Amino acid sequence: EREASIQAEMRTSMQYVDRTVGKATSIFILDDSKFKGSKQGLTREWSYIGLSADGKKVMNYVWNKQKQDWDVSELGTKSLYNMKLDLEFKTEGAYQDNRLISYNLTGKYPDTNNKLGIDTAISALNTKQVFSKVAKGKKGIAIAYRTDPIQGQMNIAVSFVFDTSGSMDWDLQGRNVKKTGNESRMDILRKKSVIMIKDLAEIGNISVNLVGFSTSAKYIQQNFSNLDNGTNTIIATITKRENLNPDGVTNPGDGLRYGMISLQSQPAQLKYIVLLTDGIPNAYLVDSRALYAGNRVDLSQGAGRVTFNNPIYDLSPTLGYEYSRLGYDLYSRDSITRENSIAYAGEVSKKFGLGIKRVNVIGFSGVNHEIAYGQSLTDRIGEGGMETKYVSATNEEALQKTFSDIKKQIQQDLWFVSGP
Ligand SMILES: [Cl-]
Ligand SMILES: [Mg+2]
């Protein structure tokens, strides 16, 4: 009967873990790629709990800061008879507003096959910033944590790229705001992106600029405002009504070009495009090289479109517009022009998207067919190799939810990259 106090020792060890875990303000569950025992591999300023190399002790590497090292201490009180241990952590949903965690701490007795310990014990955490870095179907055998915030996070740049075509004067259902009573799409976009800015502000260390696009793109605010120095200057731009004035067609490639090149010139380590469009892509710019012979066919007066038989997209870092370089279809019905408009955005993404963490695309229309190429546009932008995500917002509160979700997801990239 050496069992009785081995089981008591494992339980007290687990209470030790739960005690120190209960004081953490951020938690990462780790698999054996970022913890092997040791201190070889430990990311600085993160404290850790996990099993020894020999697998026989539960230990706690605490961050020193003043000695800038780890204070290797065993969590527990006594030997365990050179027994080898199995330690596993797991998130397990929530109880009210608390996130749950499960602990496993077992091991078979010397040279018996009697399992000892706790197969699973549920506890609750005091932080909502609990993250998993367990790839694969790996087990997850260790934890990294902090008890005080991470001081000095990364910088984040967000380029907003907003459709300003003429359709943005109608209401979400595509009816005239004078005959219905509703706000215009642009009215709703102004309000809901002001909200999104104040929400982004809370993350801290986060700058934004504003690109408009319709027939072609324009910087509404070209340089990046840090919100920690004031929400004020950009909210003035978004709500000033000589700005974002609806007019033109839909040239998302050019908008994306302005967005991505301005992001390339920002130092931030997390970079984002938030692209909002309310219509079928129906415009693109060509390089001057494409102005030859019978390449440009001008059906503009009797069909409402100008197309290029062989488009060479305007991929220049020199940002310019000329009517002679414009492919477009005012009726958004010609399959070729639509294809060329979507492909332009993909070519722009491949050239200009190298540093970019994610492109979010928002289809913002209550009219089904106007956003029927939102996913298609996003997928083409995805050829540039970054993460992409398409969302449709068909009413005023879908948009505010999509904005909030995008904030929540940037906050989580930030947490995840500051992590161990
Ligand atoms: Cl998607
Ligand atoms: Mg439109």
Author numbering: 42 to 461
Publication text:
We show that PilB is a modular pilin with a bulky module “grafted” onto a small pilin module, which directly mediates adhesion of S. sanguinis to host cells/proteins. PilB, one of the three minor pilins in S. sanguinis T4P, exhibits a canonical N-terminal class III signal peptide, the defining feature of type IV pilins. The larger size of PilB is due to the presence of a C-terminal domain readily detectable by bioinformatics, which belongs to the von Willebrand factor A–like domain superfamily (InterPro entry IPR036465).
The protein readily crystallized in multiple conditions, and after optimizing the best diffracting crystals, we collected a complete dataset on crystals forming in the space group P61. However, in contrast to these proteins, the MIDAS in PilB is flanked by two protruding “arms,” which is reminiscent of the RrgA adhesin from Streptococcus pneumoniae. The MIDAS motif in PilB, which is formed by residues conserved in vWA-containing proteins, noncontiguous in the sequence but in close proximity in the 3D structure, is functional since it coordinates a metal ion in the crystal. We have modeled the metal as Mg+2 because of its abundance in the growth medium and the high affinity of PilB for it. The Ser206, Ser208, Thr291, and Asp319 residues in the MIDAS motif of PilB form direct hydrogen bonds with the metal through oxygen atoms, while two additional coordination sites are provided by water molecules. However, PilB can only be accommodated at the tip of the filaments because the bulky vWA module sits on top of the pilin module in the PilB structure and essentially prevents other pilin subunits from being modeled above it.
